[PDB]
Design a protein around this ligand. Structure first.
Ligand SMILES: NC(=O)C1=CN([C@@H]2O[C@H](COP(=O)(O)OP(=O)(O)OC[C@H]3O[C@@H](n4cnc5c(N)ncnc54)[C@H](OP(=O)(O)O)[C@@H]3O)[C@@H](O)[C@H]2O)C=CC1
Length: 323
């Protein structure tokens, strides 16, 4: 993956496309749906795909990418693929084995990016959400800094080109960077980010430490049951996004997307519909003026669509802190 892309440069020297297609799905969808959407995204010009072991779509996402490679549409070297290790496998001795598993599902030799999915470990086992009889997740205690060293080991094994974190707070990022004998800084922190939760402080913090912020929930999230309060407001129905979309001759979505791009953020997106997937690629075509950027900074309202509420009582729930 070389410099001839709309890409930013990670602190390990590697390139990441700034617009990524997300491969998580609503509960209501078969997992094969991800094969279909990946083929569509590739044809629309997407090169960056984001996934996770817990998504359980990596095997279908791999079929889709591999058939596009086979038929000559793309090369592996022009695809940027991310996975994430899930809470059940954060123990140092389980991190690599989880990555080897995903590579086997994918039939890939490496992933371009591998993240800690959440800074919170759960009871190890095949079950992704181990619970007790009250329906409550079983937390486990892990040294996150030991998890980090196992990540670094995955990078020096060639299993992943870069390593980063997802859903870390300021204090949790510090932990890692201040860890003695640190070999690689996280290249990114993938966190929810939209006009209702604009992450100004964590963005500024990540920038100061050469950490790329990669945003999900750019469009208000797919609202997954039950991660998202079904009575939170729908981001893209927000009047000022409608107003600005008319002004610029776009839609609410494109305005949301462009807002993040102009902030130096790497942006994820998912749609189940082909024509949206094609539409999201128009983000590259137009500029929002700086007074309009300030307008959108004003929507900030601490509306967190995915607080990972099922984790609330975890020693490490990242979302208590201001940022
Ligand atoms: N790191 C983490 O912990 C997490 C990471 N993720 C990642 O983020 C990716 C993106 O998902 P998420 O953040 O939930 O969803 P987004 O915020 O990217 O999109 C939200 C909604 O926007 C709609 N939409 C997309 N394009 C348009 C458009 N052009 N016009 C109108 N509506 C549009 C989609 O609906 P529709 O399908 O109806 O078109 C979708 O439900 C995931 O696939 C996964 O990679 C997700 C959650 C957590």
């Amino acid at each position: 993956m070389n410099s001839k892309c709309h890409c930013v440069i990670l602190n390990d020297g590697n390139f990441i496309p700034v617009l990524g297609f997300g491969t998580a799905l609503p509960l209501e969808c078969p997992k094969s749906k991800a094969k279909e959407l990946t083929k569509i995204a590739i044809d629309a010009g997407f090169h960056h795909f984001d996934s996770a072991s817990v998504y359980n779509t990596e095997d279908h996402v791999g079929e889709a990418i591999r058939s596009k490679i086979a038929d000559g549409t793309v090369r592996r070297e022009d695809i940027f693929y991310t996975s994430k290790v899930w809470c059940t496998s954060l123990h140092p001795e389980l991190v690599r084995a989880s990555l080897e598993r995903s590579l086997q599902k994918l039939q890939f030799d490496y992933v371009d990016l591998y993240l800690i999915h959440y800074p919170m470990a759960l009871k190890p086992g095949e079950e992704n959400f181990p619970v007790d009889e009250h329906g409550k997740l079983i937390f486990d205690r892990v040294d996150l800094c030991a998890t980090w060293e196992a990540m670094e080991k995955c990078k020096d094994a060639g299993l992943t080109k870069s390593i980063g974190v997802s859903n870390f707070n300021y204090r949790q990022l510090e932990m890692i960077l201040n860890k003695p004998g640190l070999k690689y800084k996280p290249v990114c922190n993938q966190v929810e980010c939209h006009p209702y939760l604009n992450q100004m402080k964590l963005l500024d913090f990540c920038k100061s430490k050469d950490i790329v912020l990669v945003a999900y929930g750019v469009l208000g999230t797919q609202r997954y049951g039950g991660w998202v309060d079904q009575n939170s407001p729908v981001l893209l129905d927000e009047p000022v996004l409608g107003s600005m979309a008319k002004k610029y001759n776009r839609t609410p979505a494109l305005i949301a997307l462009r807002y993040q791009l102009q902030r130096g953020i790497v942006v994820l997106n998912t749609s189940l519909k082909e024509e949206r997937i094609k539409e999201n690629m128009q983000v590259f075509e137009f500029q929002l003026s700086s007074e309009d950027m300030k307008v959108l900074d004003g929507l900030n309202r601490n509306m967190r669509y995915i607080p990972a509420a099922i984790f609330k009582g975890h020693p490490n729930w990242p979302f208590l802190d201001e940022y």
